[PDB]
């Protein structure tokens, strides 16, 4: 029987917009017929529904702007697996490998990332309630930058899923991940490293999509989150077949960001530099700035994984994860910063390139 799910973090909820997820082997025609069935049954009950998008590639499903009053009925439709209410997400060598960045708009003409990044026509951002390009440019700078970059020889493809305030949606990211899959099917390339420097509350659909994309041979690197909390309560961080990265400072201590800081737990795979990360500033074409967060930490791992895959392209996702762990600096982080019971669960590993 079909189940309904919504973000446990109440402020992050976005009511009136629903992701109707269908059973794994549902065809596009079946999904489209189901959206029309829903539209017809709703109109018959005097309800106005709009089909915003129909998913195919990773998950059989559709996006629908409608009243909640219709959920009991929508749950009764055939092929339906589960329905998730939309929620918000927030910003937090390597030659034969392409890096996909799902983030804010980026400053591609910056002398640090000029030529390296290809700005895709993809844009899916919720409306706001230099500085608009700020977040994305710095992470593109950390990943492949000319002076401060990790994987200098790596090429990037940028997707816009976060607005000028660094806010996105679960659905926005879903459509984004689906776009990567389609681009790969239309024109196949080599190893792919997808960077997600964003996080929202635990999401069944966002995790499910990250699992399918991972099973499809694509490497997914994500931020642990800057909530000083268990990373298993945040998506895409909680998705098991993903590389979840926490942040540490110069003194092998987890990063503190005001009252909050880096996330932890059994969901985090390893940690990487996250305090005082110098990179591309969108202020001017030659400008540099120091930023912090689990985004900068994930960007280092995205650079390391690019260099590692460029050197060994036949590696399976399980093999690469072993390489990341094997080459990491072991038992260096101060366990005493994390809550008492999380210490045994949190892996004491700091990402490093082979010598």
């Amino acid at each position: 029987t079909a189940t309904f799910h919504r973000c446990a973090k109440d402020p992050w909820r976005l009511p009136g917009t629903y992701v109707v997820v269908l059973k794994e082997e549902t065809h596009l025609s079946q999904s489209e017929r189901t959206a029309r069935r829903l539209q017809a049954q709703a109109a018959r009950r005097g309800y106005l529904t709009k089909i915003l998008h129909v998913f195919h590639g990773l998950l059989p499903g559709f996006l629908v702007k409608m009243s909640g009053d219709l959920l009991e009925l929508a749950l009764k439709l055939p092929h339906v697996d589960y329905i998730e209410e939309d929620s918000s997400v927030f910003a937090q060598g390597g030659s034969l490998v392409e890096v996909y960045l799902l983030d804010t708009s980026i400053q591609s003409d910056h002398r640090e990332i000029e030529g390296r990044v290809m700005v895709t026509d993809f844009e899916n951002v919720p409306e706001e309630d230099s500085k608009c390009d700020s977040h994305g440019t710095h992470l593109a700078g950390v990943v492949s930058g000319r002076d401060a970059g990790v994987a200098k020889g790596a090429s990037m493809r940028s997707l816009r899923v976060l607005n000028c305030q660094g806010k996105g949606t679960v659905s926005g990211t879903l459509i984004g991940l689906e776009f990567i899959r389609k681009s790969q099917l239309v024109q196949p390339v080599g190893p792919l490293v997808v960077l997600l420097p964003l996080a929202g509350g635990y999401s069944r659909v966002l995790n499910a999509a990250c699992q399918r994309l991972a099973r499809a041979g694509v490497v997914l690197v994500t931020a642990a989150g800057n909530f000083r909390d268990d990373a298993c309560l945040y998506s895409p961080a909680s998705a098991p077949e993903v590389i979840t990265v926490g942040a540490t400072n110069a003194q092998d201590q987890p990063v503190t960001l005001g009252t909050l800081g880096t996330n932890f737990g059994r969901c985090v795979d390893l940690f990487a530099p996250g305090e005082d990360i110098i990179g591309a500033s969108s202020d001017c074409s030659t400008c540099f700035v120091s930023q912090s967060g689990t985004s900068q930490a994930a960007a280092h791992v995205a650079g390391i994984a690019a260099m590692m895959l460029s050197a060994e392209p036949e590696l399976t996702l399980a093999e690469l994860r072993q390489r990341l762990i094997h080459f990491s600096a072991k038992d260096v982080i101060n366990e005493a910063w994390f809550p008492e019971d999380q210490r045994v669960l949190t892996p004491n590993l700091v990402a490093a390139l082979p010598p």
Binding site: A148, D283, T286, C287, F288, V289, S290
Partner: peptide, 13 residues
Amino acid sequence: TVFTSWEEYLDWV
């Protein structure tokens, strides 16, 4: 602090 050049950052750090 925003550094207009890479060299500017190096004299600072």
